[PDB]
Structure 1
Amino acid sequence: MLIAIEGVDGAGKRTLVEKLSGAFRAAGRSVATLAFPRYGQSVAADIAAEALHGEHGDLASSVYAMATLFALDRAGAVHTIQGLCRGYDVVILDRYVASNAAYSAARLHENAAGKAAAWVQRIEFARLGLPKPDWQVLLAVSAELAGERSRGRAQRDPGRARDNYERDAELQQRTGAVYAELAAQGWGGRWLVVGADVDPGRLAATLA
């Protein structure tokens, strides 16, 4: 089973992955986790991050260029994902294809039924062959709280200055809204919308 944890930056995704992993292992399931972007491992991922921090000229100014880099990173992980699904009972991804749909649509002020979301569908799932997840869990949080976390993280870690998207409060707001639409639409597969207070044990039971 392939599960993707989605949400805006600062939503608490990494923490949910950790808690969920423990819940699954408690239930006797083998668990593997993979996070996107695959920084260090993927040049596309690194260039994208660098672009979001002021490098590489006009690269970040293009919505589709950024989406393409994140898609190329995932395309290079297809073998990894297939291998993990063959080796473990549960594979949990911290961010996946839906991240591209949410942020891309938001940057263009489009909704989940828009052009960008459809483009991501055609490119990543169909053309690049990324498998559709069995579950996509939206960790919904208020834009204000998520933002406060992204800022706090930058104040405590010098190698963690916020990226261009995180410095755009309205973009974060719109991204959260597109995520809610994607979930209601069942974009790319079935979704579950949860909060930071969700019970790992029950969530794992629902997913397994």
Structure 2
Amino acid sequence: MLIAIEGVDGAGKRTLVEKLSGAFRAAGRSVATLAFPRYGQSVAADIAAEALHGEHGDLASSVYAMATLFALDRAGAVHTIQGLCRGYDVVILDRYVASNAAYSAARLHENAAGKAAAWVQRIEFARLGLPKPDWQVLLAVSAEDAELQQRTGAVYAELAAQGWGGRWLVVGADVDPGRLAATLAP
């Protein structure tokens, strides 16, 4: 099974990934995890981060250019992902393709039915061949650029409501990981 944990910066995704990992292992399931972006490994990722800090000229001024970089990072891990899916009962990704759809649409003031979110699916899933996750879990919290972070949180909820890329669950800060694992497990 392939699961992506999503949410805005500060939501506490990593804590949820660890909680869930423990829950799955307590249920007798092997688990592997991977986090995106792969800063320090993927040059496309590193350039994107650097661009967010003002390097690389006008790069960060293009939503679609930034999206393309994070897509190339994930696409570089496509075989690692498929490997882990063969080797483990459950694979948990701390961010995945929906991160690109939510941040891109939020930046363009589009909704989850808009052009950027559709483009992300065509490029990452169809073109670059990334596997669709069995489940996408949105961690939605009251609080972790604030206006943008809040709008991204909302677009994320819209992706969950529409079933963008597959089935989702929306969870809060105090979700019971034992219960959540039983829900996610086939």
- Scaled by the length of structure 1, what TM-score is found? 0.88
In the alignment, the residues of structure 1 paired with residue 105 and residue 139 of structure 2 have an alpha-carbon distance, to the nearest angstrom, of 18
Instruction: Give the % identical residues.
Output: 100
Give the gaps of 5 or more residues in structure 1.
Answer: 145-167
Extract structure 1 runs of 4+ deviating beyond 2 A.
Answer: none
Equivalent residue runs for 1:29-108 within 5 Å: 29-108=29-108
Number of equivalenced pairs? 185
In the alignment, the residues of structure 2 paired with residue 48 and residue 171 of structure 1 have an alpha-carbon distance, to the nearest angstrom, of 18
User: Which deviates more, 50-59 or 64-73?
Assistant: 50-59
Q: How far did residue 96 of structure 1 move?
A: 0.3
CA deviations over 1:83-125 (Å, ceiling 9, x no partner): 0000000000000000000000000000000010000011000
SS of corresponding position for 1:71:
helix
Q: How far did residue 169 of structure 1 move?
A: 1.1
Q: What RMSD over aligned residues (CA atoms) do the two structures have, in Å?
A: 0.7
SS of corresponding position for 2:92:
strand
Give the gaps of 5 or more residues in structure 2.
Answer: none
In the alignment, the residues of structure 1 paired with residue 67 and residue 123 of structure 2 have an alpha-carbon distance, to the nearest angstrom, of 10
SS of corresponding position for 1:9:
coil
Q: How far did residue 143 of structure 1 move?
A: 3.9
- Scaled by the length of structure 2, what TM-score is found? 0.98
Q: How far did residue 171 of structure 1 move?
A: 0.7
Q: How far did residue 53 of structure 1 move?
A: 1.2
CA deviations over 1:56-90 (Å, ceiling 9, x no partner): 11111110000000000011000000000000000
SS of corresponding position for 1:45:
helix
In the alignment, the residues of structure 2 paired with residue 55 and residue 28 of structure 1 have an alpha-carbon distance, to the nearest angstrom, of 46
Residue pair 1:132, 1:189 contacting (<8 A) in 2 also: yes
User: Which deviates more, 22-31 or 135-144?
Assistant: 135-144
SS of corresponding position for 1:143:
coil
Q: How far did residue 173 of structure 1 move?
A: 1.1
In the alignment, the residues of structure 1 paired with residue 46 and residue 135 of structure 2 have an alpha-carbon distance, to the nearest angstrom, of 27
SS of corresponding position for 1:92:
strand
Residue pair 1:35, 1:94 contacting (<8 A) in 2 also: yes
CA deviations over 1:20-69 (Å, ceiling 9, x no partner): 00010111100000000011110001111111112111111110000000
1:181 aligns with 2:171: no
Q: How far did residue 131 of structure 1 move?
A: 0.4
In the alignment, the residues of structure 1 paired with residue 120 and residue 143 of structure 2 have an alpha-carbon distance, to the nearest angstrom, of 24
In the alignment, the residues of structure 2 paired with residue 195 and residue 64 of structure 1 have an alpha-carbon distance, to the nearest angstrom, of 30
